[PDB]
């Protein structure tokens, strides 16, 4: 853990060395320390930037998928399983962190914090055994379930985790599932070579779908479970960093946005919030 560079001692300088006077037109951020432009003291700084690395910044796990899949009777429908085309974009909290970088190679921990709550109803007398939930990652191009009791839930080759409610949330480390050498958080190109089709990240980094269901066949009364998939990007090898997203996200397929102010407006260019 290398710490910040210590502020070197400095004194009055009338030399021809101009540290402050530089040229940011060159595209080079000035490397001047406070000693360079000001007379400062020698302080041995121990402010480690360990938690400020992309590994640690992306290490915090944030929710990426929120959906409500249901257990009820025998009238199986599309509401008994939660479908997610695995993409960071879904939830904006981690989407902004990932869209702080153009390319990120990382292994992604997928933690499923399933919260099962019985749906409010006239009759809730049921006493169901502990619900078991199956979270299967369908590889891109592989068969996807059509119903909660389809053959695709028989995971011959598709990775899956069976988790019993009340235990530790199911954490599965998905490896670097990308055709390329990185994940393109932004993809300025198109889906097809004719400059048409889908536009954005959705074309590349086509992570396979994730299907969540209740391993229990049925429930006397309907119970809704919130899957709440949280992603922990670890082993980060992020490339080409980008500014944090300014405008609020509108869609999870594109970066399409409603124009937002650069920053919070202030009364005047000379307006400083200060105590009286």
């Amino acid at each position: 853990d290398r710490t910040v560079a210590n502020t070197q001692p400095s004194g009055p300088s009338n030399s021809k060395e101009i540290p402050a006077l530089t040229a940011v037109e060159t595209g080079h951020t000035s490397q001047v320390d406070p000693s360079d432009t000001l007379q400062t003291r020698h302080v041995v700084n121990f402010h480690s930037r360990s938690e400020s690395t992309v590994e640690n910044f992306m290490g915090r796990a944030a929710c990426v998928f929120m959906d409500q899949y249901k257990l009820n009777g025998e009238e199986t429908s599309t509401d008994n399983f939660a479908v997610w085309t695995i993409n960071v974009r879904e939830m904006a909290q981690l989407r902004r962190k990932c869209e702080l970088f153009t390319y990120m190679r990382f292994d992604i921990e997928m933690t499923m914090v399933i919260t099962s709550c019985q749906d409010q109803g006239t009759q809730l007398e049921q006493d169901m055994p502990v619900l078991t939930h199956q979270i299967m990652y369908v590889p891109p191009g592989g068969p996807i379930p059509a119903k909660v009791d389809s053959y695709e839930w028989q995971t011959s080759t598709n990775p899956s985790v069976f988790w019993t409610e009340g235990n530790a949330p199911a954490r599965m480390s998905i490896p670097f599932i990308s055709v390329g050498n990185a994940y393109s958080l932004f993809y300025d190109g198109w889906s097809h070579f004719t400059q048409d089709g889908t536009y954005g990240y959705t074309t590349l980094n086509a992570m396979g779908k994730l299907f969540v269901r209740h391993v229990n066949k049925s429930s006397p009364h309907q119970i809704t479970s919130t899957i709440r998939v949280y992603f922990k990007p670890k082993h980060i090898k992020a490339w080409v960093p980008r500014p944090p997203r300014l405008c609020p996200y509108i869609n999870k397929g594109d970066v399409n946005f409603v124009v937002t102010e650069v920053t919070d407006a202030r009364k005047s260019i000379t307006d400083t919030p200060h105590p009286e």
Partner: peptide, 9 residues
């Protein structure tokens, strides 16, 4: 699995 290792904090 190398993807199963901890975060390189």
């Amino acid at each position: 699995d190398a993807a199963s290792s901890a975060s390189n904090r």
